[PDB]
A and B are shown apart, each in its own frame.
Chain A
Amino acid sequence: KSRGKRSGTRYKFSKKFRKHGECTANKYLEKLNYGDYVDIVCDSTQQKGMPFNYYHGKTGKIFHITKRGVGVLVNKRVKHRIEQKKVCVRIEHVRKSRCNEDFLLRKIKNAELIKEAKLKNEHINIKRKTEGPKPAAMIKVPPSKIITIEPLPFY
């Protein structure tokens, strides 16, 4: 019967234990660029410039920057299709993401390795390994460490 703004956030928007008090005085100092990937986290110490109920935890990208506002583009599901949505949030709530730091590190490794690989004219399986079947080898174990197992009785 009731579907207000902050409906059903009795715990979600609640600040975690021993984390009360204003936002960290260094979160303002992060650097943002157009095209970066960002995460949206709804903090409650700040009140204005607040995200909405559904968007807590989602991701996106930066396409709009004002004196304090940040506009992020998000894919929100509705029944049969996905439609872009632009949400304007504030710096306190917004938070730099990690969804692309893995790929950035991979690109840096590629740049600093395949350069010398090409210099030597070597081909590598630069695709991610996804280790599957282990190889077959020989191992040692003395008979003094083999501890048998047997099912246990009842009590």
Chain B
Amino acid sequence: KVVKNKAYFKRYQVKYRRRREGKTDYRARKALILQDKNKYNAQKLRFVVRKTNSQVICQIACAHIEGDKILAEAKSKELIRYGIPVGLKNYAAAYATGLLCARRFLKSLNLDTQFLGVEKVTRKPIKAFLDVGITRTTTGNRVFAALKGACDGGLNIPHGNNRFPGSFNPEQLRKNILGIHVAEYMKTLQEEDNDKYKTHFNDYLKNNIGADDIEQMYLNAHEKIRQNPKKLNAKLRKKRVKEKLALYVEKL
């Protein structure tokens, strides 16, 4: 038999477009968006962190029946203007995107002087809730890196220590948000074999980014960013198909 029968096509029910594309969830989404109906105008702003295979994006989203509205946006590719010309998928890159997003959103809402955030590494503030983005939120993930960066920027999102590196390692959290592990990998790879080190970090070596330079470079970037924000119609279809039939009369 054939499972691709016309009856099967007739009975098929299409999925939602986003679910078919695999972009969304439509259970976490509705749980995130819906708020208690007892309260009114509760927008329940959602922070959105999406990691591509190249760079991450951080947005602030509000809900509507007409559709989601985006208030503030940040890409990983803005770190060049802040001193980071390479490695925009990095853990520190995600942290910087989160801090950039938080600072721009606060400035645009005019609460910069009212929320200074925190310093370096260890009325109620405005609220946001973190997007999962399908990706399995295991311990030590770039999404939670950006979450910590936003919280340090001045946002408030309820988060535990379970998926922060360690189960709790503040030293490793500092190292990851500062890029220390990248430096250690550079050290180990350089010691073990120079060939692999150069063929891997060719661009880092091109820009001459030393191992003991990454952490200070990211720290300087963080301080700077904190102090400064064609078609065919029916007639042609019939014409061309009748021509195709005329050719197939004597073609094969």
Contacts and interface: CB of A to CB of B under 8 A. Distances in A.
A/B: CB atoms within 8 Å of each other: yes
A152 interface: no
Given A67-B36, A67-B38, A70-B37, A28 B13 contact: no
A32 interface: yes
Interface string B41-69: 00000000000000000000001110000
Contact of A66 (B27, B38, B40, B64): B38
Interface residues of B, number: 15
Contacts of A67: 36-38
A65 B36 CA distance: 9
A91 B35 CA distance: 11
Kindly name the residue among A25, A26, A66 whose own CB sees the greatest number of chain B CB atoms within 10 A: A25
B1 interface: no
A28 B38 contact: no
Given A26-B65, A29-B65, A20 B37 contact: no
B37 A65 contact: yes
Contacts of B63: 29
8 contacts: A25-B33, A28-B33, A28-B34, A29-B34, A31-B40, A65-B37, A67-B38, A68-B37
Interface of B: 13, 16, 26-27, 29-30, 33-34, 36-38, 40, 63-65
Nearest to B13: A18
Q: Is the interface of B mostly helix, strand, loop or mixed?
A: loop
Given A28-B33, A29-B33, A29-B65, A22 B38 contact: no
A29 B64 contact: yes
Q: Is the interface of A mostly helix, strand, loop or mixed?
A: loop
Interface residues of A, number: 17
A35 to B, nearest CB: 14
A112 interface: no
B13 A20 contact: yes
Nearest to B27: A22
A28 B30 CA distance: 8
A25 B30 CA distance: 6
Kindly name the residue among B29, B30, B34, B38 whose own CB sees the greatest number of chain A CB atoms within 10 A: B30
Contacts of B27: 22
A18 B64 CA distance: 26
A145 to B, nearest CB: 31
